[model samples]
Target chain A: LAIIQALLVKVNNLVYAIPIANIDTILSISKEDIQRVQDRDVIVIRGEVIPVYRLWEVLQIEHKEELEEMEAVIVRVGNRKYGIVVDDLLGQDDIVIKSLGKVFSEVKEFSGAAILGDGSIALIINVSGIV
Target chain B: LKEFEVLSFEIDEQALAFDVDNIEMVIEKSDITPVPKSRHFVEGVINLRGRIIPVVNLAKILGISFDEQKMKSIIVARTKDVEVGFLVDRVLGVLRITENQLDLTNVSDKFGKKSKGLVKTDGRLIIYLDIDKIIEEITV
Candidate 1:
């Protein structure tokens, strides 16, 4: 029985959960702020360059429309921080994290799954798996 | 002189059976939530009342042609370690088969290792699926 403070975000209209402790900061980044550095998408802020993943592409959820400004969660992964772009910031909430069972134990991207109040699912992101 | 019962089902015209006790339940036309970055043949996961079970595309694993034409019938089964669901065509009701009629020897390699044994019932053939072994390896 595990519950945590989760910062919820939407990607391709699906809900995703990130532990609040894992988040370094949340940013509203403009389209011009993102740059391609050595084939990696990065954002330079306060002289710190952090690699970013526009999650729609990473999660294979294709979207035709583009965002002029994006919501990014700069989460702490290991010793470094990584920025994950999302569709909308669904605010923060206390959530109970549940396992996806033995059959899905091998899937790395999501540590577990959560059932929302509306009876839908929010995949708990395994931030460390993002590289 | 031994006998056992099974829950026979069909997948692309191929008759298949699972030990009756292995199945938890069968739900029709259930909603599926496809996991991101999931492996081949893994349809996704589903919430069954309270438990979360992973769903597998039965046709894809058995290398059979499938018709994904709408509502799905999911066969939820359990093994020693896990409970999983198979998206199958239809459930053909429960059946009982004699052990002597069970062709345990020279089990055909048609379905690969997934076919544990075979049976001939009333001139019709049904493939005995090795549920434990099938669930042993999650991939195709």
Candidate 2:
């Protein structure tokens, strides 16, 4: 029951995963297509408007490139939907969560960290943190 | 003799200055542990020579993407009873300004909510930070 499906995505150089159940859809939006009709605060996907949250920016990770297209994960927190702009999708897998320990007790954005097959760490994104 | 000295630093891709008296020390970025849910603008906390101090993300509060490539240091500052560190992109240099050169007019906007005024020196416009005011924004 603890092993849950996750979608791994890259934001900046760090790897993170969001529970597959939290995601509504994934998209790669072109720079030109993100119309101002939704203005700078939001983006339109599938005829619905969603707030854009730059994952790297939110994490205070330095952006290294000027991408013409951005990979986004459309997710719902409750009734409202949001688009989390990620760098790239690293694929999907089932993972066992591990607590970050007492030192990271104040952390609310991540439910826990998972050790990937390669021994690297992937933080599980808390859907409510950004929403 | 000028009226005051200000520490000019760069963050959010722009120059910002703060009063020199409030500064404690400047050091390189070290092992900072992220403290989530504490505050949206609070980037994390760092162990400074053993004592832990919360580091605020200047870019986050200022409304800009952090330039971590240039982020290698934190400015330790103290205001009133609270001591904190502010993550700055780069420490430009120290700037000296006279009272006349400091404009106390309406320079603050929605994003520059914490700025006390603007200092115009050598054709450079650096927003001056109100350290005490910034403390209130961070200290609960």
Candidate 3:
């Protein structure tokens, strides 16, 4: 089991987590400043248009798709920016990361699987390389 | 026309003649990156061992469909000073054809007026393609 400390959020009954260190800042920029890049779904942040690839969209996982109502999780590693659009902002915690091996590793955005304190398996997000 | 050995090859079922002396080497087909702004004849470049050699799809340049299913070979040849590799379907055994047998092919609308000549044998017509003339026409 790989334990990763992250900011955890609860949307309805589902638990979503992003690594605490990976989260650069929670920014509330005007929707007009977000320029659409080459990819229709991707938006530009700080002169760099990072492709906003949704975990639920790619993996066919059931999640609320409301870009306007949610805040952007901007993760910048070195010179690249990886922006994630989530429905709700859940608070931070130390979540234990686990592996699904051949089963769920093929899923995009999900780096690996992890077990919560409640014994429910939660997928780990590799925020830097979602695009 | 010179009487020298040539490593003839078949590209898209058409027999192409190349001077054996001008041929640097032959290699197996590998990963070729597609160039954004390149000639239609060019298939892009490939890392031949370590050196990057320009690749040309022989059939596409000669106005024929290059079949990927066939046993393909890359002919490394020097056109003037630039070393270029041409992708071919198969490498035929080397043969010698005399310059005297070479005859001027009647210029057609397909090949245009620039076609130098053609070589006729009992089997098929081997086009005497002027490499230097072709390179000059394409580059500029």
Candidate 4:
């Protein structure tokens, strides 16, 4: 079977995956680690300020109040990097990527979908499309 | 009285209609992924049978307000080169009206050239829309 290594991340109640190769590192940080810059969120990593994007906000998903901690995945797209803040990390898995079909063909943010071991569906994130 | 077919629907209690030939299908509301930085009236895009089509909220575009959470259907319409989905509260069904029964003299310029005419029937006034003009206004 053809399989690729993917990292499973949760936003709100939905699950999504990103290719491990595109991920630089995963950071578990508090809310204070983020700084607001010109209405955009940014975080400092290795003396470099990386822009922070909330996956829930970008997807228009409703989020609960009071977030005690945050898990961010450092994603590299071309020459720039962004920190995608997610709700939870479900670790890594090897899985096949399934196309979301023509209905979602124009949706650049999601590349495909994957079926988890539990038979649930996890949308695959398109790293380059998000930035 | 001679009658012609028109597909009538509701948007925030205001009745509207399109010539029967203008509508492709009426579908139940489905998941629409929001497109960032798109037009204010654009609700988002939805995948219909593998085709990605942009959807617009008629109420928002027309400056009307309704319980959007209660929106139930999408009216897929096509005009020449463009295909779009119009989000509405509910599809009231098709009805027929005569040319004499329509008041073409009362067209409102506020909605641009899309407001072609009006049909008053059974205590309700239905605005007849020019599909081509509406689509052109948005795509432009």
Candidate with top lDDT is 1
lDDT of 1 by residue, B24-126 (tens): 8988947888798887788888777866788889888778788888326889988875888999988889988777888877845667678868888887889
Question: Which digits, one per residue and each the tens of the lDDT, describe model 1 over residues A36-109?
Answer: 98989899999999999977787788775667888899999778998998898998988888888876667788
lDDT score of residue B22 within candidate 2: 93
Best by TM-score: 1
- DockQ for each numbered candidate: 0.52, 0.07, 0.03, 0.11
Worst 10 residues of 2 chain A by lDDT: A98-107
Cα shift from native, residue A39, model 4 (Å): 8.6
For model 2, how does the per-residue alpha-carbon lDDT over A1-131 read when each residue is reduced to its tens digit?
37989999987557798999999999887777665543355777668887877887776676868488988898888898888888889998998876544334566788877767765667789999864
Query: Candidate 4's residue-wise lDDT over A24-73, tens digit each?
Result: 99987678778899988898878988998888887777886537687889
Ranking of all candidate structures by their DockQ, best first: 1, 4, 2, 3
lDDT of 4 by residue, B69-134 (tens): 778889999888577899998999898778888887754577777787888787568898787778
Please, what is the whole-model Cα lDDT of each candidate in the order they appear? 0.83, 0.76, 0.61, 0.79
Task: Compute the lDDT for candidate 2.
Answer: 0.76
Among residues 3 or more apart in sequence or in different chains, the pairs in candidate 1 whose N, CA or C atoms overlap within 3 Å are: none
Q: Estimate each model's TM-score.
A: 0.92, 0.50, 0.50, 0.66
The native-contact fraction of candidate 3 is 0.00
**Candidates 3 and 4, the one with greater DockQ:** 4
RMSD of 3: 15.1
